[PDB]
């Protein structure tokens, strides 16, 4: 049949937020709790559950009477975007083996022993847990990679899906790839509570917190397909989004970490003068198998609109023509391009900080988009000139300027348009916001 029509008649509970309301919206009804300390954050198109560890940070569903799916045998599949700080080395030690759950159609406390199922973490391990009124509970453990800038629970909006084919197996997916498995055939009826619970429980980290955001139930075990057109459905390409998965934002300091060379950070040569790429410096641990490139090293750069147009709003969206800054010794330093300024075989036009020379136009017009990788928190920069003509998509050229050492220099290119369809390009940047989710150990 059709996905859409297949995805959309088979959701049973889909939480919305609009108004700073949760509701579900599938059609069902099914009443929504939210406690005090429930809090709202950015989410991947609109506003988002943010849970800290405290009783009043919750928030319960309480199952429509059409809805008991988990009826004898019956399949269904939980999805969400789910966002978790990276742990720190110490509270990797410390609480590594404190398994907490984070959402749970399961009553602890009265009795129907595991009722259900769950969504729990322990340390990096994601898990799902399914388990029958007859004890038989059945499992998915995730253990996530050791290089939290690619780990998916490290600081990053991510895609959870969960599929429970009764007659097979159970299937977790994660951004619409199959990153674990489990048998699920042979089990009891499953008699959970009539609530779901969206809560940290049982977690020994005070300081720890998740997000949660577009929770949702379908009443059959979705298949790769649909599951891959769910995932990509949110991504919405009006808003562009920082590293972390959130809503790109004007005057807010980001460290710029290009995609096609993630180990490497933006440094400047002189006021007044070019960019280049360093070696980010990085954290190993091999007692916790821990390891990742540090983050907010190099240039702080700064969005700005470049004329603010029609609304005082703080989110950058695809098309907005901007302003580009770099933070140096306190001062903002404007970016963009001389007129015949230095450029390699005039294609690869330098791109300069702070350029002042009088006389010479120096063209900052920027326009901030997003022509590819959907999947990717990355952002493309168009610079024009004064004419409106395009000077090319912000990128690197690796040549040597003067006598400088052979440097990876951030230019303007026209090329990078003709090579949209690659999966590693150059004009690719991450736009990193310092951020209490990640703190280098
Ligand atoms: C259209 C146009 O005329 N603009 C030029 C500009 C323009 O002259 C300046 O912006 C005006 O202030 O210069 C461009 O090239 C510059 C050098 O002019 C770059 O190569 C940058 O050079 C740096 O170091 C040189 C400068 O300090 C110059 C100043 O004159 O002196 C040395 O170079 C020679 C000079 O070119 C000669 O005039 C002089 O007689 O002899 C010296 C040495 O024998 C320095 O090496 C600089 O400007 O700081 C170092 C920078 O890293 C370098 N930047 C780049 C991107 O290469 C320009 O791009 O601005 C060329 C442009 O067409």
Redesign the pocket.
């Given at each position: 049949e059709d996905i859409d029509v297949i995805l959309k008649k088979s959701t049973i509970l889909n939480l919305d937020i609009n108004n700073d309301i949760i509701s579900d919206i599938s059609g069902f009804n099914s009443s929504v709790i939210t406690y005090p300390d429930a809090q709202l954050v950015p989410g991947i198109n609109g506003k988002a559950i943010h849970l800290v560890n405290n009783e009043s940070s919750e928030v319960i569903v309480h199952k429509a009477m059409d809805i008991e799916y988990n009826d004898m045998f019956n399949n269904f599949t939980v999805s969400f975007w789910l966002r978790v700080p990276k742990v720190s080395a110490s509270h990797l030690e410390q609480y590594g083996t404190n398994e907490y759950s984070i959402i749970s159609s399961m009553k602890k406390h009265s009795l129907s022993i595991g009722s259900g199922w769950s969504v729990s973490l322990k340390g990096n391990n994601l898990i799902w847990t399914l388990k029958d009124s007859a004890g038989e509970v059945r499992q998915i453990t995730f253990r996530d990679l050791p290089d939290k800038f690619n780990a998916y629970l490290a600081n990053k909006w991510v895609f959870i899906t969960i599929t429970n084919d009764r007659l097979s197996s159970a299937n977790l997916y994660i951004n619409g790839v199959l990153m674990g498995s489990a048998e699920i055939t042979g089990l009891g009826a499953i008699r959970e509570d009539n609530n779901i619970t969206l809560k940290l429980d049982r977690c020994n980290n005070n300081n720890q917190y998740v997000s949660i955001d577009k929770f949702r139930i379908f009443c059959k075990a979705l298949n790769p397909k649909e599951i891959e057109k769910l995932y990509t459905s949110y991504l919405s390409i009006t808003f562009l989004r920082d590293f972390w998965g959130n809503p790109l934002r004007y005057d807010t300091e980001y460290y710029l970490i290009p995609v096609a060379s993630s180990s490497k950070d933006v440094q400047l040569?002189?006021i007044?003068?070019?960019m280049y790429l360093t070696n980010a410096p990085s954290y190993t641990n091999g007692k916790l198998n821990i390891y990742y490139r540090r983050l907010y090293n190099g240039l702080k750069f700064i969005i700005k609109r470049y004329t603010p147009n029609n609304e005082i709003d703080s989110f950058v969206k695809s098309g907005d023509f901007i302003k580009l800054y770099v933070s140096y010794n306190n001062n903002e330093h404007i970016v963009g391009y001389?007129?015949?300024?230095?450029?390699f075989n005039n294609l690869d036009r330098?791109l300069?900080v702070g350029?002042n020379?009088?006389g010479?136009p120096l063209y900052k017009k920027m326009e901030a988009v997003k022509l590819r990788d959907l999947k990717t928190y990355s952002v493309q920069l168009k610079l024009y000139d004064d004419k409106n003509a395009s000077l090319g998509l912000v990128g690197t050229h690796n040549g040597q300027?003067?006598?400088?050492p052979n440097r990876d220099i951030l230019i303007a290119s026209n090329w990078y348009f003709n090579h949209l369809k690659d999966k590693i390009l150059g004009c690719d940047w991450y736009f990193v916001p310092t951020d209490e989710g990640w703190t280098n150990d």
């Open positions: 040569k002189n007044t003068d070019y001389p007129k015949d300024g230095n450029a330098i300069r350029y020379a009088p010479i300027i003067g006598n400088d």
